[PDB]
Design an enzyme around this catalytic site. Structure first.
Site, PDB file in Angstrom:
ATOM      1  N   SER A 118       2.456  -2.398  -3.591  1.00 46.32           N
ATOM      2  CA  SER A 118       1.562  -1.417  -4.212  1.00 46.32           C
ATOM      3  C   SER A 118       1.469  -1.633  -5.719  1.00 46.32           C
ATOM      4  CB  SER A 118       2.061  -0.002  -3.931  1.00 46.32           C
ATOM      5  OG  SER A 118       2.243   0.204  -2.543  1.00 46.32           O
ATOM      6  N   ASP A 120       7.423  -0.362  -5.270  1.00 44.08           N
ATOM      7  CA  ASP A 120       7.002  -1.210  -4.149  1.00 44.08           C
ATOM      8  C   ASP A 120       6.108  -2.347  -4.646  1.00 44.08           C
ATOM      9  OD1 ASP A 120       6.301  -2.200  -1.549  1.00 44.08           O
ATOM     10  OD2 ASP A 120       4.517  -0.923  -1.568  1.00 44.08           O
ATOM     11  N   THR A 131       0.845  -1.230   0.000  1.00 42.68           N
ATOM     12  CA  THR A 131       0.000   0.000   0.000  1.00 42.68           C
ATOM     13  C   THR A 131       0.864   1.258   0.000  1.00 42.68           C
ATOM     14  OG1 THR A 131      -1.902  -1.046   1.097  1.00 42.68           O
ATOM     15  CG2 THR A 131      -1.723   1.347   1.297  1.00 42.68           C
ATOM     16  N   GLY A 136      -2.166  -0.965   6.441  1.00 45.41           N
ATOM     17  CA  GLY A 136      -2.137  -1.985   7.493  1.00 45.41           C
ATOM     18  C   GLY A 136      -3.243  -3.005   7.292  1.00 45.41           C
TER      19      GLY A 136
END
Ligand SMILES: [Cl-]
Ligand SMILES: [Mg+2]
Ligand SMILES: [Mg+2]
Ligand SMILES: [Mg+2]
Ligand SMILES: [Mg+2]
Ligand SMILES: [Mg+2]
Ligand SMILES: [Mg+2]
Lengths: 195, 243, 231, 226, 204, 244, 250, 196, 241
Positions: free
Chosen positions: D169, D166, D1, D47
């Site tokens: 993501s 990332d 994320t 999270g």
């Protein structure tokens, strides 16, 4: 208190349960009856942790007997099994769960059908033509998968059960001191005194 | 009617008759007073000697809260003790959390709210006492008087009990004749006189005088009982004035 | 009248009738006398029987080695209050290794009785108590009323016809206070005091109850032939 | 994320990627991470996904009741205070990491919240597994007195850095712009730089390919009349 | 030991043109031991269908719980619950057990009776909603199912074409999973008819 | 204290009656009449709404007939708000039973449960009883079609035909006269409407003043269907039976 | 202390009457008139802003209240009782519905929850009934537009149109003559203003009248754009100017 | 973290760095660690950011309620409230707080509350991970009754060294001055304090 | 006739205990007045110290609830202080929970809700007080909100409470009928206080010394009470024109 088997034939349900009880390295008893009559046409066998098994079984028995008196009516095997399942599902998330696996053999007088329910300590219920708990199924299911028919007589069911016990007695490391066999049919519950 | 049979019931006047009946118990009690002086406060009370069998100086009426507050009351003595026990709990929890000893205005409200709470329900009875109390804190001397209703104000001088009218008149003279103020030692002397003068309303039985004080200069801001020579000196001054 | 239905109600003149009615129960009770010197403190109690077949109701209760009381009124209420005193004396000994001061014991009894006079549902205690004891400040005598009022005295009496004994002690004040180091003479003065409250009946061997505590004397109760010496 | 927040001249903008994962597997390729606390107070969550959604809904519900009770439009500091005290009480067990942004009668605001209940103030923030990639972009290009257009550009560029660099993501960029004296504009799939290419083959089967044992009609209707 | 893989099993759902499909295997086991080949994992409350994978006792408990709740819903609302509303109810019910959760992977499938719009949704064990346009997968062969669905799926499939796609997705995924198989069921759902088909497959 | 204001709702009279139960029954006697008739092939529930208005939205209105589950329904006589409290509790009990045993709750077991709740309010708690009388219409596979009634005392009884609310004395006499054991649902429908038409305090019995329901095995094959009649359907059955 | 009133304060009298409920209804009768009218494409609720003093700012006292974006309420009777019921109604719409199903409750079920609260104040220990009758107007997808009345007993009834409070008997007769099943929302507002004028003595304008509608979705009142399915609240309170505009065409 | 509070002639000054870390990542490089609990009673926070924020908020609430009833609280009273929370909840807290305030009667005061929840009144206090490196410097350079300018220099030089050696400290040096004249905020940037 | 003793309905639908609580409100024989300026809200109240033994500095019916909110009470001091303590606790709790200062109107509603509960629950009696809350709200500006024993509350342009409230109310009404605005068009709070005192003098027909009055002033971010000398300066300015 480890071996319990069940088989549903044409007109009856047969439950076979081992007779041994072990405390430490010593076999205390070789004639223990691991079963309770819940109602005239419903029998429950059990296996699991010491103490919990009988305590749970007797608690279930008391509740079904209470229902029978209140309503002047015998609950169907399906209804009893659902009650038992909920109690175990309840119990698995308790502070100290009841480590008890059961087989419920009943004859439904309304439908005129035998019924066998297998429920483990988690509350995992299944209706089966034949069932077992623990390791019992590992030795016996290949024989039952081969020989079982739904139109078997009570006598044929007992013969197939003898073959299952013989295979257990051959390949299983522990000595379970034979089995007590009980039959559940339209006339109620009776014990086979020579097996 | 029937409005006076139950506590917390408003009469058609807007009055709580049960609280007013509690005042009658206060008016029936012995005379107690309070005098605010230059750097502290003085408390005094009339103790009726019902019998010779009473041990002198033993049945102490004035009570200390924490180490800097004095409390005296007229009316039902047990009710007063109950209120002081609460006051002590309030003072302890204040000091526990905030470290500093409870200021007198803060302490006054703690007693006030508790007494007022006993006018809110029919399951409790109002307090049968009027309490005179005070002491020295960081902002100086403070004297308070608290009634059964929960009502309280700050005072220059205060009086309650059977001889309150006489006492009040005497207190009013001191306020007029001393605008600059009264010393702690003077206030002790004057307190003795006023109790002796107020004893005319209770003249049947003889009495015992009890005095206490908190003063910044005389007691280091701590509550102490007036004892021995200083007490006798005040008794002599009082006896001289009535004759 | 309309204000005596419960303890939570003041009368128009500021009286508490339920408390006054509880006070009345003490006046119906049998007489008991308390008195002290500077070395000892004594309780004397006239016990009451139901009839000639019955026992004489006990009046004196021990609270600790250095403290005890006598009762007049509802006996079960005395048992509750004396049990509380036993616990408080015991708490002081166990926690602080300290014998409970008689004056502090009186303050505790006052507060316990007070709570029953200001709340709904409850009732006042229907018993009066005379507490004697010997602590770090010498001999003591206390009078307890269920109104909550506790008073320290040289001598006193409560119960039916207690006024006669109280007047006697008021005359004898200067004499019996000086009876130091002589337990028998102090008891005599107490037996003579309680005799001023008797009518028709006299002090017999199963009628009289005496208790004493002092400098080197634990709280001990005398009944039966142990009081024949004083009859 | 990857989630970011960026202050500008007359308001604040938040942005997020749209990939939700269960281990190394992508559960949803177009997840919605921009949550509404109130009309003009929005937050983005990293999270535990259920926790970020649940805590946003709960505080959003209580914020709405508070707004009705007080006859006032909700404030960002209220959402912040209620979120942090809820999260603190659960001692980090509610795994919600949020960037909270919005406009109210007091002005425009931007905060971050940790799962244990600590909060931060800033002009630019980033959270999640791609927060370091995003923060690198923000630290390179952020300046004071950004315009609306510049802030949207910076925010989406920061999310893109997370998307590409990332592994946690991916997929698309969602944006929400909150400007003072205006309606908040939620821009779902503001950028779409990861459309799948056409497959080489069609995998539509001939009818009758699957072996069937039994067929039956399922009665979904209620018990019938007559 | 891992509660989500003791019993095994899988569920997959897919959207098509004016239709949805939901399918599951029939296995229930105790780790290596196969116990039942008739353990259906798809249930329905009115026109809303719910598939549940994971720990079998929780599968049964949750079915009974959602039957309970949807029956009360219907009595009070005087109408059958819709897929969108039921999805929120599943999410809410799972999250209330945040720190003692049911070890399950639920999957909702249905068509809104008013709009006619096909709907599917998936959840993690604690309530997080995955509302995908294309397909939802769950169970011990979810990795395998993702692989099958990602390549086999195309949008706007007709009901009978969607049947073939979802069936082949399930079957071939199950045949690469030890704890799935032993039979399979496929529901083809249209606005006012639902067809249920049991598939023939290898029994090992 | 508080004792002064206590009415003491759970005490016997010198005659051994429960004051509040008796007074609650007096309240119920002014409520609109509800009738239940049991036939061999089903049950009928008929009830009169109390003096209505032309501006009342009837098609969305419900004050008399309520569904407890698919097999059991109730007719209400008394305080509607009190009834809804009990109705919701009964709905929950039915679902609790279904979850526990995986079978629909038998009618009597549901009735006994609600009646026990009513009983409790007459023996403990110091609260007023529920001012409600129920007619229970239901089916199960043990006793088949069943009618019961319960009142604020918590006493319940079984019936072939029964009325609650206003004019029960007159209504029960009329039902006792024309009821027969071999009666069918269509005949029972007629009897119920004819009885209400004669006992009503209104000038004439019309569709807008009625609530109607049937429980029939007139559901396709071995199963039971509940039918809460719509306003137009009540209007039709009134014409069919020859009342309007 | 402790609440020692654990017994019912409302009890049946020998005649079967629940006195405290009847007396609560009497308090409602003394209250200012409020009304509600249902149209084909909306619902209107209205009442008089009976200002206690001219120095009081009557805009700060809201007699017509938003319960949900699609549900509104008005009352007759005791204002403080109404205010706390609005607080409870707003909360219960969340706790017993929105936090479960992720959507706002339908009108009939929110009414049911409010009714339950009012019923409990009629049976629970140590409390009196609420001294208000409520008129709750609302819209939801499957039931359409609706209007409900809730009384102190907890009983509720659906209405096409009705009035409660001071001049309810005359107002209900006025509504019976004017209402039909083909009314448009603007026609219902017009009838509402006509009906309300009869029960008002003094000033009759936008500042003394409070009026709200349940009608079309208001995307301009949503506060955000970007989600197609979210189209805004159906509840809208009419302004002082909007009322006065319709009083010229009166 | 590097925090300190120093009493001087006209009152007290609080000082702090602005770095918060999650491991080796700097989660915030412009943190405000100087926190207001009352008008002229502030605190420096170290330890768990969640815990010290929660504590400070509760203290602010307590002192606001205190003020409404009893007037302005003393610095000692504020320290006592901090201590009560830190001591009673010592098992579940990781908080190292310095409390600093200005009265007119008492003037500038400093109280340090370490991990265990004990209280220590001091002329000055240092805390946080970076404080270890400046125990020597601060002990040698602190004087009582310094001027405002001297005290600012002392804190600037001290925190400069703490920042230089401690990786967990850095960013800007924030300061809050508490005197009779009022409340003054100061900020000092890296280019200024690094060349000292 | 126990319907007059506790808060249940009489046959007329009335709550007599609430009505009698309103009567207790005037027991102090004190009148209060509140008005709004451009930037401020002023509240004045009569101060009567009948006993010479009293400390006059402790005799007060004006309370500082929060830094922004002030409260004047009409009614007996025990109930006044009960309400004052609760309002202070509520205001402090609000700030802690929601992160901003409790608005004047929100506190008024909260205290009004608490009062409503006493009119419905039997075990709790109404407080015999009327509470006038004042502030300069950050959103609404100068604010006056008043609560009573019925649980009723509303905002005010100006208001008056006490035995002679009607005379003061009409006097204020007549002034605002002339000016045609909702406030006192004045820059400084000093002149708004002078207006408030002047119009109370006119309405009551009595002159005031510095010890006969009590004054509270709300400005942006603070509420404060004036000292006797501050009031004296106000009285001098009134007399000099
Ligand atoms: Cl509230
Ligand atoms: Mg099993
Ligand atoms: Mg922690
Ligand atoms: Mg396989
Ligand atoms: Mg295999
Ligand atoms: Mg560094
Ligand atoms: Mg009350």
């Amino acid at each position: 208190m480890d071996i319990i088997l069940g088989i549903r034939v044409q007109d009856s349900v047969i439950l076979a349960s081992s007779k041994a009880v072990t405390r430490g390295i010593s076999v205390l008893k070789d004639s223990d009856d691991k079963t309770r009559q819940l109602s005239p046409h419903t029998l429950m066998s059990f296996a699991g942790e010491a103490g919990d098994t009988v305590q749970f079984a007797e608690y279930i028995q008391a509740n079904i007997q209470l229902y029978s008196i209140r309503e002047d009516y015998e609950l169907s095997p399906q209804a009893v099994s659902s009650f038992v399942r909920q109690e175990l599902a309840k119990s698995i998330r308790s502070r100290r769960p009841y480590q008890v696996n059961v087989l419920i053999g009943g004859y439904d007088k309304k439908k005129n059908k035998p019924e066998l329910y297998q429920i483990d300590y988690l509350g995992t219920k299944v209706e089966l033509p034949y069932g077992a708990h623990g390791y019992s199924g590992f030795y016996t299911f290949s024989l039952l998968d081969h020989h079982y028919r739904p139109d078997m007589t009570t006598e044929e069911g007992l013969d197939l059960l003898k073959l299952c016990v013989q295979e257990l007695e051959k390949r299983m490391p522990m000595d379970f001191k034979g089995v007590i066999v009980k039959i559940v049919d339209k006339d109620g519950i009776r014990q086979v005194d020579d097996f | 009617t029937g409005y006076d049979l139950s506590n917390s019931v408003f009469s058609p006047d807007g009055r709580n008759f049960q609280v007013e009946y509690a005042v009658k118990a206060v008016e029936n009690g012995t005379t107690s007073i309070g005098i605010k002086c230059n750097d502290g406060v003085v408390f005094a009370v009339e103790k009726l000697i019902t019998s010779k069998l009473l041990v002198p100086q033993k049945n102490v009426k004035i009570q200390v809260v924490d180490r800097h507050i004095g409390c005296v009351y007229s009316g039902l003595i047990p009710d007063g003790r109950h209120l002081v026990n609460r006051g002590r709990e309030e003072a302890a929890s204040f000091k526990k959390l905030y470290k500093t000893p409870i200021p007198i205005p803060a302490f006054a409200d703690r007693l006030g709210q508790y007494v007022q709470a006993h006018t809110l329900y029919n399951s409790v009875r109002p307090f049968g006492v009027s309490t005179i109390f005070g002491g020295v804190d960081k902002n100086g001397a403070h004297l308070y008087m608290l009634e059964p209703s929960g009502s309280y104000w700050g005072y220059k001088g205060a009086a309650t009990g059977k001889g309150r009218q006489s006492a009040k008149a005497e207190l009013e003279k001191l306020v007029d004749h001393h605008p600059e103020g009264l010393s702690a030692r003077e206030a002790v002397k004057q307190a003795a006189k006023i109790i002796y003068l107020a004893h005319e309303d209770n003249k049947e039985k003889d009495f015992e005088l009890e005095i206490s004080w908190c003063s910044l200069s005389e007691t280091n801001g701590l509550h102490k009982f007036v004892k021995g020579d200083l007490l006798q000196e005040a008794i002599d001054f009082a006896q001289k004035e009535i004759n | 009248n309309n204000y005596d239905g419960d303890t939570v109600t003041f009368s128009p003149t500021g009286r508490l009738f339920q408390v006054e009615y509880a006070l009345e129960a003490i006046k119906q009770g049998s007489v008991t006398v308390g008195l002290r010197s500077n070395t000892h403190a004594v309780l004397v109690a006239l016990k009451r029987n139901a009839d000639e077949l019955s026992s004489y109701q006990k009046k004196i209760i021990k609270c600790d080695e250095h403290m005890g009381l006598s009762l007049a009124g509802l006996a079960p209420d005395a048992r509750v209050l004396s049990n509380y005193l036993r616990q408080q004396c015991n708490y002081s000994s166990l926690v602080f290794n300290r014998k409970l001061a008689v004056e502090r014991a009186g303050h505790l009894l006052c507060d316990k009785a007070q709570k029953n006079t200001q709340s709904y549902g409850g009732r006042p205690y229907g018993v009066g108590l005379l507490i004697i004891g010997y602590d770090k400040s010498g001999a003591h005598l206390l009078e307890f009323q269920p109104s909550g009022n506790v008073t320290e005295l040289y001598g006193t009496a409560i119960g039916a016809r207690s006024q006669g004994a109280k007047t006697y002690l008021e005359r004898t004040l200067d004499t019996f206070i000086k009876i130091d180091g002589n337990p028998d003479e102090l008891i005599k003065a107490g037996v003579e005091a309680i005799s001023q409250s008797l009518r028709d009946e006299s002090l017999t061997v199963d009628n009289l109850s005496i208790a004493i505590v002092g400098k080197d004397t634990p709280f001990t109760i005398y009944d039966g032939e142990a009081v024949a010496k004083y009859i | 994320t990857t989630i970011v927040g960026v202050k500008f001249n007359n308001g604040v903008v938040i942005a997020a990627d749209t990939r939700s994962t269960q281990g190394p597997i992508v559960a949803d390729k177009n997840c919605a991470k921009l949550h509404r606390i109130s009309p003009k107070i929005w937050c983005a969550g990293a999270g535990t996904a259920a926790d970020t959604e649940a805590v946003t809904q709960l505080i959003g519900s209580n914020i709405e009741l508070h707004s009705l009770y007080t006859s006032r439009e909700p404030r960002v500091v209220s959402a912040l205070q209620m979120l942090k005290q809820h999260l603190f009480k659960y001692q980090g067990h509610i795994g919600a990491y949020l960037i909270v942004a919005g406009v109210d009668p007091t002005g425009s605001h931007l905060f971050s919240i940790h799962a244990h209940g600590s909060t931060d103030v800033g002009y630019y923030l980033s959270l999640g597994s791609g927060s370091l990639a995003a923060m690198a972009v923000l630290e390179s290009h952020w300046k004071q007195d950004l315009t609306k257009e510049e802030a949207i550009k910076l925010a989406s560029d920061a999310i893109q850095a997370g998307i590409w660099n990332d592994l946690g993501s991916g997929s698309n960029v969602d944006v929400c712009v909150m400007e003072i004296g205006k309606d908040a504009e939620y821009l779902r799939n503001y950028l779409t730089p990861n459309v799948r290419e056409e497959k080489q083959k069609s995998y539509k089967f001939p009818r009758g390919t699957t072996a069937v044992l039994k067929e039956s009609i399922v009665n979904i209707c209620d018990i019938q009349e007559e | 030991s891992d509660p989500s893989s003791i019993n095994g099993g899988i569920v997959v759902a897919m959207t098509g043109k004016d239709c949805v499909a939901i399918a599951c295997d029939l296995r229930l086991g105790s780790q290596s031991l196969g116990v039942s080949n008739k353990f259906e994992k798809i249930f329905h409350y009115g026109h809303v269908f719910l598939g549940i994978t994971g720990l079998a006792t929780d599968v049964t408990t949750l079915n009974e719980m959602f039957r309970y709740k949807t029956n009360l819903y219907k009595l009070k609302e005087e109408r059958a619950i819709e897929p969108e509303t039921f999805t929120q109810l599943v999410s809410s019910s799972l999250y209330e057990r945040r720190f003692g959760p049911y070890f399950v992977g639920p999957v909702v499938a249905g068509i809104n009776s008013k709009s006619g719009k096909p709907f599917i949704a998936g959840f993690d064990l604690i309530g997080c909603i995955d509302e995908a346009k294309d397909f939802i997968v769950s169970g011990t062969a979810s990795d395998q199912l993702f692989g099958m669905c990602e390549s086999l799926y195309e949008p706007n499939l007709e009901p009978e074409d969607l049947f073939e796609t979802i069936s082949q997705a399930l079957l071939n995924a199950a045949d690469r999973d030890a704890l799935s198989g032993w039979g399979a069921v496929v529901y083809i759902i249209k606005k006012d008819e639902v067809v249920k088909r049991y598939l023939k497959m290898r029994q090992d | 204290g508080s004792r002064r204001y206590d009415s003491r709702t759970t005490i016997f009279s010198p005659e051994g009656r429960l004051y509040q139960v008796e007074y609650a029954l007096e309240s119920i006697s002014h409520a609109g009449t509800a009738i239940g008739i049991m036939a061999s092939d089903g049950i009928v529930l008929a009830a009169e709404r109390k003096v209505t208005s032309t501006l009342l939205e009837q098609d969305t209105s419900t004050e008399k007939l309520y569904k407890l589950n698919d097999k059991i329904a109730v007719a209400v006589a008394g305080l509607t708000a009190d009834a809804e409290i009990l109705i919701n509790t009964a709905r929950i009990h039915a679902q609790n039973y279904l979850k526990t045993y995986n079978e629909d709750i038998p009618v009597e077991i549901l009735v006994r449960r609600l009646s026990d709740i009513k009983q409790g309010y007459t023996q403990h708690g110091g609260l007023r009883p529920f001012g409600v009388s129920f007619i229970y219409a239901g089916y199960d596979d043990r006793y088949g079609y069943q009618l019961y009634t319960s009142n604020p005392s918590g006493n319940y009884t079984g019936w072939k035909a029964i009325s609650v609310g206003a004019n029960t004395s007159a209504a029960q006499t009329l039902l006792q006269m024309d009821y027969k054991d071999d009666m069918k649902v269509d005949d029972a429908i007629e009897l119920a409407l004819k009885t209400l038409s004669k006992t009503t305090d209104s000038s004439a019995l019309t569709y807008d003043r009625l609530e109607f329901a049937t429980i029939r095995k007139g559901a396709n094959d071995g199963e039971v269907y509940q039918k809460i009649f719509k306003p137009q359907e009540i209007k039709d059955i009134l014409v069919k039976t020859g009342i309007t | 202390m402790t609440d020692r009133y654990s017994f019912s304060l409302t009890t049946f009298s020998p005649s079967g009457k629940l006195g405290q409920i009847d007396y609560a209804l009497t308090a409602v009768k003394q209250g200012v008139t409020s009304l509600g009218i249902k149209a084909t494409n909306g619902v209107v609720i209205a009442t008089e802003k009976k200002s206690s003093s001219p120095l009081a700012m009557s805009e700060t006292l809201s007699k017509v209240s938003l319960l949900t974006p699609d549900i509104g309420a008005v009352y007759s009777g005791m204002g403080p009782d109404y205010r706390v019921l609005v607080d409870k109604s707003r909360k219960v719409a969340h706790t017993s519905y929105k936090r479960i199903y992720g959507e706002y409750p339908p009108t009939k079920l929110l009414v049911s929850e409010v009714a339950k609260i009012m019923q409990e104040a009629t049976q629970s220990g140590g409390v009196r009934p609420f001294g208000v009758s409520l008129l709750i107007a609302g819209h939801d997808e499957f039931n359409g537009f609706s209007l409900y009345q809730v009384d102190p007993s907890g009983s509720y009834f659906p209405w096409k149109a009705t009035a409660i409070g001071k001049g309810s008997v005359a107002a209900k007769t006025f509504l019976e003559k004017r209402w039909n099943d083909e009314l448009e929302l603007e026609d219902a507002i017009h009838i509402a203003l006509l009906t309300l004028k009869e029960s008002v003595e003094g000033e009759f304008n936008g500042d003394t009248i409070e009026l709200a509608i349940i009608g079309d979705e208001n995307p301009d009142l949503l506060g955000y754009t970007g989600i197609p399915t979210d189209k805004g609240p159906r509840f809208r309170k009419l302004t002082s100017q909007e009322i006065n505009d319709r009083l010229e065409a009166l | 973290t590097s925090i300190m509070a120093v009493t001087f002639k006209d009152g007290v000054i609080l000082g702090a760095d602005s770095r918060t870390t999650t491991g080796a990542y700097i989660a915030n490089r412009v943190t405000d660690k100087l926190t207001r609990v009352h008008d002229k009673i502030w605190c420096c926070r170290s330890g768990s950011a969640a815990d010290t924020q929660a504590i400070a908020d509760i203290v602010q609430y307590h002192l606001e309620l205190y003020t409404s009833q009893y007037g302005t609280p003393s610095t000692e009273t504020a320290a006592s409230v901090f201590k009560e929370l830190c001591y009673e909840n010592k098992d579940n807290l990781t908080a190292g707080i310095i409390v600093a305030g200005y009265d007119d009667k008492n003037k500038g005061e400093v109280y340090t509350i370490p991990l265990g929840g004990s209280v220590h009144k001091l002329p000055y206090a240092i805390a946080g991970s970076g404080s270890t490196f400046i125990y020597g410097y601060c002990d040698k350079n602190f004087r009582e009754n310094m001027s405002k300018e001297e005290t600012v220099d002392f804190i600037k030089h001290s925190l400069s060294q703490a920042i230089k050696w401690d990786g967990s400290s850095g960013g800007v040096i924030r300061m809050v001055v508490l005197t009779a004249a009022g409340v003054e905020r100061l900020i000092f940037y890296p280019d200024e304090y690094e060349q000292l | 006739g126990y319907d007059r003793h506790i808060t249940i309905f009489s046959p007329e639908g009335r709550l007599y205990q609430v009505e009698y609580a309103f009567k207790a409100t005037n027991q102090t024989n004190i009148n209060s007045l509140a008005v709004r300026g451009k930037d401020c809200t002023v509240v004045i109240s009569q101060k009567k110290v009948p006993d010479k033994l009293l400390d006059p500095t402790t005799v007060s019916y004006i309370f500082c609830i929060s830094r922004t909110i002030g409260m004047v009470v009409n009614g007996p001091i025990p109930d006044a202080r009960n309400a004052a303590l609760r309002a202070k606790a509520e205001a402090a709790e609000f700030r802690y929970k929601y992160g901003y200062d409790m608005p004047c109107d929100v506190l008024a509603k909260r205290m009004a809700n608490l009062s409503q509960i006493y009119t419905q629950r039997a075990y709790m009696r109404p407080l015999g007080v009327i509470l006038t809350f004042v502030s300069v709200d950050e959103e609404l500006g100068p604010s006056i909100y008043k609560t009573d024993p019925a649980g009723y509350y509303v905002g005010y342009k100006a208001t008056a409470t006490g035995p002679k409230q009607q005379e003061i109310t009409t006097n204020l009404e007549n002034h605002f009928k002339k000016s045609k605005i909702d406030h006192i068009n004045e820059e400084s709070w000093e002149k708004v206080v002078e207006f408030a005192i002047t119009h109370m003098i006119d309405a009551l027909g009595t002159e005031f010394s510095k010890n006969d009055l009590e004054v509270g002033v709300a400005t942006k971010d603070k509420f404060f009470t004036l000292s006797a000398e501050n009031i004296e300066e106000r009285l001098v300015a009134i007399a000099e024109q």
